[PDB]
Amino acid sequence: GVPTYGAIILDETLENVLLVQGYLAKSGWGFPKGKVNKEEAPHDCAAREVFEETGFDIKDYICKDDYIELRINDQLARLYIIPGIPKDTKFNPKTRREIRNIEWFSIEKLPCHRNDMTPKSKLGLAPNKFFMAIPFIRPLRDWLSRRFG
Numbered sequence: 001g002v003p004t005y006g007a008i009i010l011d012e013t014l015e016n017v018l019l020v021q022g023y024l025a026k027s028g029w030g031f032p033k034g035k036v037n038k039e040e041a042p043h044d045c046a047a048r049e050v051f052e053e054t055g056f057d058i059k060d061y062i063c064k065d066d067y068i069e070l071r072i073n074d075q076l077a078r079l080y081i082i083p084g085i086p087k088d089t090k091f092n093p094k095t096r097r098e099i100r101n102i103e104w105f106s107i108e109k110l111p112c113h114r115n116d117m118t119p120k121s122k123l124g125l126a127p128n129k130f131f132m133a134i135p136f137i138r139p140l141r142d143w144l145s146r147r148f149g
């Protein structure tokens with residue numbers, strides 16, 4: 001699939017992250033990100049997608065080496081880590097046809113896996129509104145421990 005780029009924005013305490021809520025197939029909460037355009041550099045795609053989805057421009061804050069990248073079902077998603085953004089920042093998407101809401105979440109309260117349904121002897125995972133964010137949570141926590149401690 002086409003690579004996606006975006007950001008993990010943290011506040012100044014490093015204990016909250018900014019998530020966005022879309023519609024329909026992207027009806028849950030996830031980090032701001034989207035698909036790279038032809039010939040567009042990863043940092044420019046991350047900034048574009050984040051500004052489209054949040055109205056906040058990360059361009060002056062991106063650090064080249066500071067990101068988490070995952071390959072899920074053979075599609076690569078790279079989120080640049082952007083700490084220290086104040087919680088009173090006014091975030092407003094460009095297109096509310098794509099973004100329902102924008103909120104800060106406590107990192108420690110976010111799930112890092114979905115729950116099974118072993119209580120019901122049924123296979124699979126229970127729905128979770130953080131499903132898009134979840135794969136990045138443990139790597140983020142590990143990354144923050146290594147970088148800040």
Ligand SMILES: CC(=O)N1C=CCN(C(=O)c2ccc3c(c2)OCO3)CC1
Nearest residue numbers: 020021022026028029030033034098132
């Ligand atoms: C116009 C536009 O940019 N698109 C349309 C709908 C929104 N998209 C996202 O980039 C997107 C991905 C994952 C998400 C998310 C949003 O919000 C919660 O998790 C896909 C592309």
